[PDB]
């Protein structure tokens, strides 16, 4: 047995997103909906057709007859912006059955620059005759930044690493930038700085040894 | 009905693979397990606690005992690895349930557990009547870890943001977290702690406000 799912569909917020999922009878079938956000297992929405479990808002709404069901995201939310699978059991093979899923984008969220917080080597760090600069960046849609170090206005490249940015509990993203230095370079400069492009705009932040 | 999985867990090229998927006598649930790679559609690789789709090689069998059921992947590929669930019928709910996934690697270079490093609030961002602490997490591999943060002894949820960790130049992975609060809130508790699990191993870092220097 086959379901088959648009693999794309694009969605405003506030309006409506519709998620089909189509299969030969499907109707005969309960149709159960799952949302997957990456790296966290998928999370049941809907479930016999049109039922929804504990805790997930009644904007979620499924249906199915003929050869379609679908789930329906009414009043959509940056959060809803994931995966969805729909899911059937098939009596012949005896074993549940997935489409291969729909990434629903929540197109216009706006755009926020990025805050910037940028930390000096920590007390128990020096005295561990170490030292590392870090970087905060959070907050920011969309989700890429560039960062860019100097040391005294001079530009640093080597032994900076800047995380791939991730989606926090807020739909924004947070990033980190770090720097390894030896306490000897961080005592041996007037200041340090983190730079942060993001969407064309620049902030940058300045920290130096008290 | 809760299900619990090991969030990672990681074998050499050619070594058994175990995925553990407990629960409360599971071994009277049918447990079905799904394999899942990247930017794709979970995979059914073993159905009813043990019998395997059509064109899933041997190395896979399922096996469901009392309170452990467990995924066996024998002499590993590459191609073996996958984000790997669990999920059982559970009609006390009345509907299914999954576990919430185990990260699978098959090591390419040696593990390495993460070095962490926790900052507190710098008297500038204090002054600022802000307030957040950073634990950077670095050079580890497989790129897998579970932070949990406290508040002099009580365990903190409110203001925490976990980044997904993500591989850097050296080709060990990173990821940080960080804990928002006011000034007041910091300068309230006696310490702040940030613990971070991989794997088997766990580390913590505490930090202490002070009335500065």
């Known amino acids: ?19 089909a999922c189509e299969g030969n009878n499907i109707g005969s079938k309960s149709v159960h909906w799952y949302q997957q956000k990456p790296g966290q297992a998928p999370v049941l929405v809907v479930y016999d057709d049109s039922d929804r479990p504990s805790g997930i808002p009644d904007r979620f709404s499924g249906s199915n007859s003929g050869n379609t069901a ?33 990434k ?21 760090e020096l005295q561990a005759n170490k030292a590392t600069l870090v970087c905060l960046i959070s907050d920011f849609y969309p989700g890429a930044v560039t960062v860019a170090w100097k040391a005294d206005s001079s530009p640093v490249k ?9 989606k926090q509990s807020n739909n924004k993203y947070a990033a ?33 040894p008290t």
Not at 113 to 124: K, N, R
Not at 178 to 204: A, F, I, N, R
């Open 1 to 19: 047995y086959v379901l088959t799912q648009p693999p794309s569909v694009s969605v405003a917020p506030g309006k409506t997103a519709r998620i």
């Open 70 to 102: 679908a789930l329906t995201i009414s009043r959509v939310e940056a959060g809803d912006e994931a995966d969805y699978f729909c899911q059937v059991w098939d009596s012949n093979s005896n074993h549940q059955v997935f489409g291969g899923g729909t």
């Open 104 to 124: 629903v984008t929540v197109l216009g969220q706006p755009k926020a620059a990025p805050s910037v917080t940028l930390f000096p080597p920590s007390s128990e």
């Open 158 to 166: 080597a032994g900076v690493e800047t995380t791939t940015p991730s």
């Open 176 to 208: 980190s930038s770090y720097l390894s230095l030896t306490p000897e370079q961080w005592k041996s400069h007037k200041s340090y700085s983190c730079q942060v492009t993001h969407e064309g705009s620049t902030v940058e932040k300045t920290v130096a």
